[PDB]
């Protein structure tokens, strides 16, 4: 689970360096790990393809 | 008065000539690093030219040592 | 200096000539197969390099590459735009959600 | 700094050498002989035992000992300059640590021979999640490679065409420091040695029917990028161009073993030409690149007694 | 608590603490603006509560600075060429100058003495919290290298203005038997062979604190000289190319304040980590810092 | 008539002269190793600078002694 | 008048030559390193005559200075 | 006091500009190797702070005899 | 003339020879990297030269001192 | 008549200016070498303080002759 | 006939052409060691080599033309 | 009374050029004796009286300094 | 000539003496590499005696000018 | 009338000075190469310390040129 | 004579002075590129000696000079 | 003596010190490299000695110069 939760957040800093956006801290969004892997994989597909 | 005054003209050559030579002694490696700099990229050119520009404050002073030179004589 | 290389090569023939496009002068020659083969080394021996364009503008019929570079060049300008508009919009609709 | 203290050290260890009969000598050996010759040798002094793996082992801490010192006991100039001497093993170990990386063996899996920086921040770089912060890791002030690599570094994350690349620009990051030095002959010699990859690379990919300007690299004097495709192709005639330069020798062969043999040549001869320098730094390169040629020359006869090599086998190996 | 006293004293120039005081204004809009401060080919990026402290330490600055330049009396330079502000008794147009400054013949033994003071001042108080910190630590060699140190310092200070001094040595000879007499105890209850290499380094970094006063006055002749060039290129040469010699005086003013008052502001820092870190040591293992739980939020 | 006043001029202008030269002659190897470190990233920009300005108290003591002659005369 | 005119064309050749001997020291360096870069690339050409001709503003104080005391003599 | 003052004014200014001379000069190597020791790494900046202010000693020594010869001046 | 005349020439002639001793300064390392470049390919023989040239001004300008010099004179 | 004390301070002011000059050209190389050694290793810093104190006693020996001097002035 | 100045000018002049050879030698020295090593590198570009080593004597000939003008403002 | 400084003059010129060389020696000296001190501890003596030995110009010119004040 | 000779001996002496340096100073790496050649190639020992005597004409032009001095003299 | 004994010291002085300046500047590579070679090997100290202390031949050809001052003096 | 003969004999010295750091400083390099030769190899000794020898022409110059100037002493 | 024998013993003591240190200056390359060529070999001890001792016939001259000038006095 610490290796799943440690790929999403690099899949996050990907996602967000492809975006060219900056990791800026903030209030976090609690959810389920499954859950927010599926909020991930659709947005970082399209921005991937993009 | 006719060897006064004579005197210290040569006093500001002294302390002008001098100037400008610790002036580009400085100069020298400081230009050549950043030619190599700007030779690495042309990224890096801002910071070389700030070093670069960064020796003459000491030909400033001398400069204005000279003209304190030139109201004494 | 390629045509001395061209009278190396099929003499009253080998037709090569440089027409426009003047950043390069596209000498193009044409002789054979196999002698053209072997005239074409020996111009790059002289020194010359063919037209190998990567992809299949470099891999397929001349006419049909010419086609396909002007229809990628009439339409890549338009597609590039939107594919910034809507990297910039999926941007600013899901920054957020991506930094919580 | 002082490149005459290090001089004289160097010159001790120019007296520590040994001479072309305890090789010639050495034609006829068998193991035991070469045993007990390596034992009157100052680099059996590391000589733990019998066997081939022991003798490699001894001949390693022999040059760690012997060679591993001219990294240290220097600071300044001359340290830039020398540290660009010692430098193939340094980036074959992090051509390894990118191979390991990018294939997924253990971090203990390459034997990682000894170098210019520390093992300890070799091991400390088999964990680092971005390349740049696994170069920040590996970034020493003076390693060439470590500006070479984040130079590289803004294309992916870990590419096998960046590891390419990479070498690609690490031969021209050490061209460019090899010109930015008040140095006579380490320049030539590093041009060289440039020339000569780019022939080796050459002659590697020759019939390959890839695109040589991205194969070929700039830095060199003694051949042409028209050269350079000349020798792409199959036109041995380019080989034979090499007239009044170092490449003398190298004419009317195709085949890359004894190509490379006498571009190893050429290197030593050019190598022996650093003897004339003894107050800059081509000195210690001369005996630096001596003691390589002992290395191989001793792996080689332990090749040749533990095999039981014919003297005509190895000939074309002690002829320079 | 000194160094923006030392700073205040190094430049005295009421205009540039003005242009000091617009610069942090501009800072504050950017600070209010709560944009993190991001400067391109600086690669200065920043959060706005350093910015912030930054500026409280400007204001802080600019507070004493603008009291020592009223000491020395001086705004935009020597204005009391155009609007006698400053008072001196060869040309009194207003308020008397505490320090006139231009003049060294009556000021610069007092600026030299003034900083020597605040130098040795500044070696008590570092050598002190060196052997009060050994004390604490129970460990005596350090405090009687501390008690040994100031105790030369004091013999050295005391032989200085003796024999190189003044005259009537009486008072002070039994000083500098005892200082010296204090120097070798401490040698031989220390046995370090910290020599009188080390003695000589402290007094080094003792006198190193006349640069203040230096700098001081190179900036003020630096900044007086422009003025009185830029003032009679004006007014008495002509006095119609005011704008143009005014506006070319203030530009190579801001140029030459560009050059040097970077610079200047850094000796101080410079002094004080040099002097009252290294007296006390704190160069010492460099601690372990408290390093929490993170939540980075 | 006296040209004490042209020598102690010809001796603070040698005194500026020498003072510039020494002190661009730390700034030349200074400038170089600072150079050569912003080339290596911009990490440490700030302390390169500061050990770049830190040669000035020479120059600025040069100065001062200078005044004092000036003072003196 | 006695040696006072020939002592300050002295102090302003000694000027003038001083800072030719500095104007020259830096560029020593400074053409070296951009004859580097350029035998490296000629697309640096420009950065390169600038850094060269960064050097020669002592050499315009050095004639200003000169024409200074020129004026003076 | 004549033409002596002039002559102590230029020896203590030959004095404190070739000390300056010598603190640049020892200044020099010794800041180019404590910046590479600080773009080693950050955390030996205090001992190359102490090997740079090490050398000042000289100038020091050598403001002191310039205020004892302008105490005799 | 008196004494003027050949104070003036000395003058003339320490500006001329400090002068020919700092363009021969820069052009030490100039030509050096000039033949370096020469060395590489004959390529570069129309920018060697203005390299080489650069270096000239200096020698022009000390030239125009002594003609001034010698108008005076 | 005076003309004495002045050469005499002239004198000493030559002596402690190149003595300084000695003891920062000693020093540089010293410094380098310990920081190189400080560098390298931490343990030895003292060891490198000693002998970078070493130089001293040309600084030692200059002011005594100065103080000799002094004393005769 | 100036009793000290005709002294005086020939020690401006001498100075100006000692100082001129040392720079014209200083910068020879780098120019020859250069031709010398890209002699023993090919003798084929001696002629550009040789225009090089010639090229620094210019200053000796404005020296000489000093120390002439000098010489005829004896 | 005009010789009475110039010998002074020129003693200080003595002991001052004298401290250069010295000085000039015992950079390289001192740099060879640090760097064997950064290899081991076991070349104290040694890379000591190595660099010992360029005080004798010091020495010299502290006898002449002597025997030039003795003069004075 | 009781006074003019002796200085311009001197001035011939000067010529000489810094004539013989700044041909020293050229023949010192010219005499270097040209023995590198050597011990490269016998086959070049002509042109490291031609490289080897273009040095001497420096010489030769301060020997007239000296000669040219005698002739004054 | 008594400028002979000042003067006669100060060339024995300068004569004094130089000859350990070059003497310094021979036994600073020459104890260089031998602590260097000593640091390889304790096994070459005497031959080592014999090629140093060569040097010294200079310096007491110094020192008696300097004690016939003296008996001049 | 007088003051002709002392000025004269401080020319002579001084070119001779110069003359000998210039031939050593063509020496030093000379005798180092023919030590590193002789320790390449025994058999290209005549040619280093040679390349030895060759320097001393302007010490032969300047005796030559000296010799003169002592004719005309 | 006045000012003809002192200035003389001056010209005579600049020559020795400035032909000390040339010679030094030669010796401190040849005797570097002659301790390399020690610390390679105790083979070529000769040699190198007898390049190590050819450099002092500059100091023999000049003593020879300094004795004919103490013959003059």
């Given at each position: 689970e610490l290796r799943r939760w440690e790929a999403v957040s690099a899949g996050a800093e990907?996602?967000?360096?492809?975006?060219?956006?900056?990791?800026?801290?903030?209030?976090?969004?609690?959810?389920?790990?499954?859950?927010?892997?599926?909020?991930?994989?659709?947005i970082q597909a399209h921005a991937e393809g993009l | 008065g006719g060897l006064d005054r004579g005197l210290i003209a040569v006093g500001m050559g002294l302390a002008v000539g001098l100037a400008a030579l610790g002036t580009g002694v400085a100069q020298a490696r400081i230009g050549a690093a950043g030619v190599g700099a700007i030779a690495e990229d042309r990224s890096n050119f801002?910071?070389?030219?700030?070093?670069?520009?960064?020796?003459?404050?000491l030909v400033i002073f001398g400069l204005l040592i000279a003209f304190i030179l030139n109201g004494r004589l | 200096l390629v045509e001395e290389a061209l009278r190396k090569a099929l003499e009253d023939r080998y037709l090569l000539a440089?027409?426009?496009?003047?950043?390069?002068?596209?000498?193009?020659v044409v002789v054979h197969r196999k002698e053209v083969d072997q005239a074409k080394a020996a111009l790059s021996r002289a020194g010359v390099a063919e037209l190998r364009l990567p992809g299949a503008l470099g891999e397929l019929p001349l006419s049909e590459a010419a086609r396909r570079l002007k229809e990628r060049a009439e339409a890549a300008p338009r597609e590039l735009s939107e594919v910034r508009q809507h990297l910039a919009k999926l941007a600013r609709e899901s920054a957020s959600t991506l930094q919580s | 700094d002082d490149f005459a203290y290090l001089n004289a050290r160097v010159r001790v260890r120019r007296g520590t050498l040994l001479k072309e009969s305890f090789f010639q000598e050495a034609l006829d050996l068998s193991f035991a002989d070469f045993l007990r010759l390596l034992s009157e040798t100052v680099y059996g002094g590391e000589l733990a035992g019998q066997g081939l793996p022991d003798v490699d082992r001894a001949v390693?801490?022999?040059?760690?000992?012997?060679?591993?010192?001219?990294?240290?006991?220097?600071?300044?100039?001359?340290?830039?300059?020398?540290?660009?001497?010692?430098?193939?093993?340094?980036?074959?170990?992090?051509?390894?640590?990118?191979?390991?990386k990018a294939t997924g063996r253990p971090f203990e899996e390459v034997l990682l021979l000894p170098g210019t920086l520390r093992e300890e921040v070799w091991r400390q770089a088999y964990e680092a999640q971005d390349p740049a912060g696994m170069a920040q890791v590996l970034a020493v002030p003076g390693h060439p490679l470590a500006r070479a690599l984040r130079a590289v570094l803004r294309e992916t994350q870990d590419l096998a065409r960046v590891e390419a690349l990479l070498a690609k620009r690490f031969f021209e990051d050490v061209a460019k420091?090899?010109?930015?030095?008040?140095?006579?002959?380490?320049?030539?010699?590093?041009?060289?040695?440039?020339?000569?990859?780019?022939?080796?690379?050459?002659?590697?990919?020759?019939?390959?029917?890839?695109?040589?300007?991205?194969?070929?690299?700039?830095?060199?004097?003694?051949?042409?990028?028209?050269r350079f495709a000349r020798l792409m192709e199959g036109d041995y005639a380019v080989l034979d161009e090499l007239s009044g330069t170092p490449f003398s020798g190298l004419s009317g062969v195709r085949d890359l073993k004894a190509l490379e043999r006498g571009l190893r040549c050429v290197l030593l001869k050019e190598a022996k030409k650093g003897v004339q320098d003894?107050?800059?730094?081509?000195?210690?390169?001369?005996?630096?690149?001596?003691?390589?040629?002992?290395?191989?020359?001793?792996?080689?006869?332990?090749?040749?007694?533990?095999?039981?090599?014919?003297?005509?086998?190895?000939e074309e190996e002690v002829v320079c | 608590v000194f160094f923006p006293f030392w700073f205040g004293m190094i430049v005295g120039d009421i205009g540039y603490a003005l242009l000091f005081y617009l610069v942090g204004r501009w800072l504050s809009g950017y600070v209010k603006r709560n944009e993190p401060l991001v400067i391109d080919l600086f690669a200065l990026k920043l959060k706005p509560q350093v910015i912030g402290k930054l500026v409280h330490i400007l204001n802080w600055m600019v507070f004493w600075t603008v009291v020592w330049g009223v000491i020395y009396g001086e705004f935009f330079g020597t204005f009391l060429e155009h609007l006698g502000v400053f008072g001196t008794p060869e040309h009194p147009g207003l308020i008397p100058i505490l320090i006139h400054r231009i003049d060294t013949a009556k000021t610069a033994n007092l600026l030299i003495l003034l900083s020597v003071a605040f130098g040795v001042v500044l070696v008590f108080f570092g050598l002190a919290l060196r052997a009060y910190?050994?004390?604490?630590?129970?460990?005596?060699?350090?405090?009687?290298?501390?008690?040994?140190?100031?105790?030369?310092?004091?013999?050295?200070?005391?032989?200085?203005?003796?024999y190189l001094g003044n005259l009537q040595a009486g008072w002070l000879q039994g000083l500098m038997y005892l200082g010296f007499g204090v120097f070798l105890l401490a040698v031989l209850m220390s046995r370090i062979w910290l020599m009188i290499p080390e003695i000589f380094t402290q007094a080094g970094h003792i006198l190193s604190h006349i640069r203040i006063y230096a700098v001081g006055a190179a900036g003020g002749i630096l900044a007086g000289l422009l003025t009185d060039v830029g003032f009679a290129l004006a007014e008495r040469l002509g006095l119609l190319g005011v704008l143009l010699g005014l506006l070319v005086a203030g530009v190579l003013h801001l140029l030459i304040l560009l050059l040097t008052t970077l610079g200047h502001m850094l000796q101080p820092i410079r002094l004080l980590w040099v002097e009252f870190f290294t007296k006390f040591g704190f160069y010492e293992e460099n601690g372990r810092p408290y390093r929490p739980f993170k939540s980075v939020r």
């Open positions: 990907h996602t967000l360096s492809l975006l060219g956006l900056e990791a800026e801290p903030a209030r976090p969004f609690p959810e389920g790990l499954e859950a927010a892997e599926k909020a991930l994989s659709p | 801002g910071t070389a030219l700030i070093f670069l520009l960064l020796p003459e404050t | 440089h027409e426009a496009y003047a950043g390069g002068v596209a000498a193009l | 390693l801490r022999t040059q760690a000992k012997l060679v591993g010192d001219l990294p240290r006991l220097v600071t300044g100039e001359a340290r830039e300059a020398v540290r660009l001497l010692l430098l193939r093993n340094d980036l074959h170990n992090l051509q390894a640590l990118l191979r390991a420091a090899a010109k930015g030095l008040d140095q006579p002959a380490l320049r030539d010699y590093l041009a060289l040695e440039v020339d000569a990859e780019n022939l080796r690379t050459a002659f590697k990919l020759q019939g390959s029917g890839l695109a040589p300007d991205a194969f070929f690299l700039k830095g060199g004097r003694f051949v042409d990028r028209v003894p107050l800059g730094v081509g000195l210690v390169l001369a005996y630096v690149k001596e003691r390589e040629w002992e290395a191989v020359r001793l792996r080689l006869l332990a090749r040749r007694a533990y095999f039981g090599l014919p003297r005509a086998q190895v | 910190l050994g004390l604490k630590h129970r460990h005596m060699a350090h405090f009687w290298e501390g008690v040994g140190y100031l105790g030369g310092l004091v013999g050295v200070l005391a032989l200085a203005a003796s």
